[PDB]
């Protein structure tokens, strides 16, 4: 399940919900783009395996 | 620097007289889908030692 | 009065021009968090692959 | 009072739950104990 | 033209292609049909998934402003469709450019398109549904979530293959290194008569 | 194959479940969700703000 | 997906609680302040004071006014001005004019799949509105709305 | 009915009850200390006003 | 600062190691050639697997590509760059202080007749060498400089 | 939390105790002195009058 | 038995009782709105789960 | 009568009642309490009409 | 290899144990004496004042 694309998306939208609550948080914005990069990391690893 | 087209250069690392010019050894060409179109032939020469 | 001036800086957004000292430190924290999290994840995923 | 509220907020920020972690710890260590034994026979 | 495939040799005519439906025996056939039907179908499914995401993301992302006050800068890069000519066609210089308008209607399949002599036939190669090419109202192809440009000197039976989702993930990446870019506010930080403060979510 | 495979699978399982056991020990002894900024960094950022 | 969604709603609910709780205490002090203001004004009404006693009472009213204005401009445990609406980065009012400078939209957040909830009561709601159970002016003039206009006018009249 | 969440269900279902009970305990101790039923803004919404 | 100085040492030792392996693989190529030539079909099962084992270990040291040649010899490439080992011929490498910042260590490879081109920290960032290098360069320096900055 | 450290309820009760203590001290001070007013804190305007 | 249509509906009518006692009161008038909406919340959530 | 012989149709009356349902009131002045009018000379309601 | 207990936990806990003992000793001193300041730096400025 480390490969679970869902897990990555869920984490990303956790970041998004937390940012949505506090639009100011630099941490949440920066972490949201980080989780986007982790999401594409999941995507890319799956794709490269195929 | 031209999608579907490349410029290629050659050298002899053991014969110092083969100094590579900016003149490309050949240009390579690709069709409407990336398949070799034309340009890939050349004859190369170097000095000989002993 | 100048002592008050020094204290006032504690609130001010000087460093980033929009960011104060404290939130800049928080930004550093979130940066490390983002990296470490994403790299932990990717490391384990590629580990499963290998 | 403001300090009391802030301290409460911090407390929930840094801590999880008392009973949750103790319980999960105990159970999972039991499962670990069992896993040891499973290997122990497996080597046979 | 991006594959390897098994061919037989004729007396002097040389090499001939045969469908993997014909060569479906033991190892070879298993390999071909796995890669073509199972592997490419999953490729295209993951590609459609990735497609909509970044795209359906950016599309909504455009609406907001960001922390510098500008209209936020859209997030994702994504791989563009590729279309293929087939070698036996008339010309070898007409590359059909792909044309994207709608990411909510893409369908995760390869498409085979052919110019039949008066008009075009289109098909989705997994469902293999056959239907005459829907067009834009301006002489170019339309299919669900994608659209395509058309050649001119087409052969009777000029036969193209379209991959609308397969290449999507390969370049996909975050284009936003900077936190300020994110389109958080619904209004500008700098418009003269509206407010968003730092907190407009 | 299967012998080395057995031993490796067993050790994978034991190692992972052990690594679990240590985490909860750290949480309990510390008295915290976190000490490391990889535990829950967002919590730490909002924590510095609160501080 | 379901479990993650429930967690997400849990966090949003957490933050709504976080804001509202602190607002509660600030408003408690606000109401106590205006109650004692009312009481002092009753004494301002007494007509056996020495005029300098009226000025003294004006000084006390000034203290109360300053306290109210202090409360109005308050921030939260992140330095955000709570009573600003969206503009939480700036001081929302002016102790001279009694003006309001924040965004007159309340703050909004969703906590569960149905309940979309408002957590920020932008100052104009609190200090510049009267509810339709309105004790009216007996002469037909528009009823005041700005607390600070009221107290400043009274302070000036006393002094 | 397979569960690590059973032989665990049992437990949590206990933890949940303990949480409810302790919340009631806190309410009781707080009120008994304060001498008031109305302490928060949510002992009695109408009562606050009246 | 001390954690930067620590990684420099390992970088040097790892360059020494890549030099070590490359020669072993060259002698393996040559010895397989001769052994199979005398074999006339006899295949040194162990040695072939030795070639692959040493390749795989060296592959962990740094980003590595591998390919077989005519006859049975191997090509090896720094995949981002170029092919260094072919036939029974293997090239060399050296550890150097970088041109732009001589206070930090980086690798220099030699195309022997062409020159010992210094490779600064850019291309190396995969494999254990890269594991050290991208950490030190991207992660550690950004950290030190951000601490220094907001400061 | 994690090993009922820094318990909220105790701090809350301590605050209520603070308030009770203040009220008690005020009452004893006034009862002892013989005056309702002992500092400007009691009745600012009344002090002057 | 805490989360149930019965509990919310009971509370809504109790709020309405406090209102019928005090038709004029703005506070009671508003407080009734909140619970009136809470009924909406419960209905929506339950049906959506189905 | 556009239906053909034995054409069938399907009413699911309450299938979306809850999903559509929403509140339509926010103001304290909004709620209806008096048994007759208040803006007319032929009635006695006052404000406190419950 | 990082997993080696090496009683990581035992040390771990102990550290925290002596920290708690430090706090406890502060508390007991203040409790028995009645003072808030005993060392030179429980509070330096307040000590001088």
From Swiss-Prot, chains A, K:
It comes from the Bacteria. It is found in: Secreted; Bacterial flagellum. Belongs to the flagella basal body rod proteins family. This is Flagellar hook-associated protein 1. It comes from Salmonella typhi. The chain holds residues 102 to 151 of 553 of the full protein.
């Amino acid at each position: 399940k480390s490969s679970s694309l869902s897990g990555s998306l869920q984490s990303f939208f956790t970041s998004l919900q937390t940012l949505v609550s506090n639009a100011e948080d630099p941490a949440a914005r920066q972490a949201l783009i980080g989780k986007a990069e982790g999401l594409v990391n999941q995507f890319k690893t799956t794709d490269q395996y195929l | 620097t031209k999608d579907n087209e490349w410029a290629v250069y050659t050298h002899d690392s053991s014969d110092p007289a083969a100094t590579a010019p900016t003149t490309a050894s050949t240009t390579l060409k690709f069709n409407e889908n990336g398949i070799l179109e034309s340009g890939g032939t050349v004859n190369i020469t170097t000095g000989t030692i002993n | 009065r100048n002592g008050q001036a020094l204290l006032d800086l504690q609130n001010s957004n000087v460093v980033g021009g929009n960011k104060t000292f404290n939130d800049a430190y928080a930004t550093l924290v979130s940066d490390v968090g983002n990296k470490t999290s994403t790299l932990k994840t990717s490391s384990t995923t590629q580990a499963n692959v290998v | 009072d403001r300090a009391l509220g802030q301290k409460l907020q911090m407390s929930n920020l840094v801590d999880v739950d008392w009973n949750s972690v103790i319980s999960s710890y105990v159970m999972q260590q039991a499962a670990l104990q069992a896993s040891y034994k499973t290997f122990t026979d497996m080597q046979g | 033209p991006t594959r390897t495939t098994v061919a037989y040799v004729d007396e002097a005519a040389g090499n001939i292609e045969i469908p993997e439906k014909l060569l479906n025996t033991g190892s070879l056939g298993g390999l071909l049909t796995f890669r073509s039907q199972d592997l490419d179908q999953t490729r295209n499914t993951l590609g459609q998934l990735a497609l909509a995401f970044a795209d359906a993301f950016n599309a909504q992302h455009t609406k907001g402003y960001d922390a510098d006050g500008n209209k936020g800068k859209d997030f994702f890069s994504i791989g563009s469709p590729v279309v293929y000519s087939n070698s036996n066609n008339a010309d070898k210089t007409v590359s059909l450019t792909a044309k994207v308008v709608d990411s909510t209607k893409v369908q995760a399949t390869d498409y085979k398109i052919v110019f039949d002599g008066t008009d075009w036939q289109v098909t989705r190669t997994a469902d293999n549904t056959t239907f005459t090419a829907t067009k834009d109202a301006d002489g170019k192809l339309e299919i669900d979530g994608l659209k395509v440009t058309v050649g001119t000197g087409a052969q009777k039976n000029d036969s193209f293959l379209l991959k609308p989702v397969s290449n999507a993930i390969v370049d996909m990446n975050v284009k936003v290194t900077n936190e300020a870019e994110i389109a958080m506010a619904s209004e500008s930080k700098l418009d003269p008569d509206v407010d968003t403060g730092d907190s407009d979510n | 194959i299967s012998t080395q495979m057995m031993y490796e699978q067993n050790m994978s399982g034991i190692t992972n479940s052990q690594a679990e056991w240590m985490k909860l020990g750290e949480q309990m002894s510390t008295g915290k969700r976190v000490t490391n900024p990889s535990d829950d960094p967002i919590a730490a950022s909002q924590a510095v703000v609160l501080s | 997906q379901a479990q993650a969604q429930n967690s997400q709603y849990a966090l949003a609910r957490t933050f709504a609680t976080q804001k509202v709780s602190l607002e509660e205490s600030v408003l408690s002090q606000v109401t106590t302040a205006i109650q004692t203001a009312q009481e002092k004004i009753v004494y301002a009404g007494n007509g056996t004071l020495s005029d300098d006693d009226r000025a003294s009472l004006a000084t006390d009213l000034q203290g109360i006014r300053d306290q109210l204005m202090n409360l109005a401009n308050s921030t939260d445990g992140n330095g955000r001005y709570i009573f600003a609406g969206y503009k939480t980065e700036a001081a929302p009012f002016d102790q001279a004019t009694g003006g309001y400078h924040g965004g007159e939209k309340s703050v909004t957040q969703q906590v569960d799949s149905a309940r979309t909830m408002v957590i920020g009561h932008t100052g104009a709601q609190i200090f510049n509105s009267i509810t339709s159970n309105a004790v009216p002016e007996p002469d037909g003039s528009d009823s005041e709305k700005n607390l600070f206009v009221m107290l400043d006018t009274a302070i000036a009249a006393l002094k | 009915m397979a569960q690590v969440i059973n032989t665990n269900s049992l437990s949590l279902l206990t933890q949940n009850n303990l949480n409810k009970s302790q919340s009631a305990l806190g309410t009781a101790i707080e009120r008994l200390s304060s001498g008031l039923r109305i302490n928060s803004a949510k002992d009695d919404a109408a009562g606050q006003a009246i | 600062r001390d954690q930067d100085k620590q990684v420099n040492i390992a970088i040097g030792s790892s360059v020494a190691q890549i030099n070590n392996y490359a020669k072993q693989i060259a002698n393996l190529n040559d010895q397989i050639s001769r052994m199979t030539g005398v074999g006339a079909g006899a295949s040194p099962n162990d040695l072939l697997d030795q070639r692959d084992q040493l390749v795989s270990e060296l592959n962990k040291i740094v980003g590595v590509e591998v390919s077989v040649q005519d006859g049975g010899t191997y090509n090896l490439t720094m995949a981002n760059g170029y092919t260094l080992v072919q036939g029974s011929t293997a090239r060399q490498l050296a550890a150097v202080p970088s041109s732009a910042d001589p206070t930090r260590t980086t690798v220099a490879y030699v195309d022997e007749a062409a020159g010992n081109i210094e490779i600064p920290e850019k291309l190396l960032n995969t494999g254990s060498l890269g594991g050290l290098l991208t950490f030190r360069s991207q992660d550690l320096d950004q950290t030190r400089n951000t601490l220094g900055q907001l400061a």
